[PDB]
Amino acid sequence: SCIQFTRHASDVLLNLNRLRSRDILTDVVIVVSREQFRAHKTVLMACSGLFYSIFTDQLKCNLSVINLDPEINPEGFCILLDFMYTSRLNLREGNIMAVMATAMYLQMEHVVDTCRKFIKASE
Amino acid sequence: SCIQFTRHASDVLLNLNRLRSRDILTDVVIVVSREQFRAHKTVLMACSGLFYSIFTDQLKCNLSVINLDPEINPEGFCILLDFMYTSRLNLREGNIMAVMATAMYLQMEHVVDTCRKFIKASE
């Protein structure tokens, strides 16, 4: 018999992004080819199958620095990190291959699906 | 020129609640009249003006235990904590006064607004 506030999840995510922009309570640095990205472990886990697996590991859950595979493009990661905190994906002809490859590695199934669809439309 | 994934914010919140239910990466205990509630500081800040003020304080941001005012009802807090992680509010005739008072203390403006409206309808 609950009532539901429609905008609550969006408002929560907006506030989480405000904390990220001000670097408040960020607890991990993600290193991508020497580029560094600060974030909240819980948000990373909530959005990515890879971060979920990493931070549920009894040893890795305590790491303050995570280094990604050297094949990962920092711009592709930056676009996906922005998507995690906003629901908005900056998908462009020039970045779609790097974004799809990064989303496959991060295990972000819905992003992989839209990249596959946008690539299929261009062929 | 971004695209947006409609269900992303809801999916993030659903995963954050799954982490809460399994006690994964919870970093604070909220004490309410001897009852204890584990949660994520970032989610508490994202939902409440009071927790936002507490965890942006340079000394309180480092506390693992927060004790609420003894007038706060643990059931009212439990209902609001559930709302924070799900967007669903279990508002009933028997709990509405305790829920409104707790939401006013926690500074959860949208919850206070619906309680005021539901109380006004009953008079």
């Binding site: 009532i3 539901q4 429609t6 | 669903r88 509010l89 619906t114």
Partner: peptide
């Protein structure tokens, strides 16, 4: 607010 809505009835979910």
């Amino acid at each position: 607010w809505v009835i979910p």
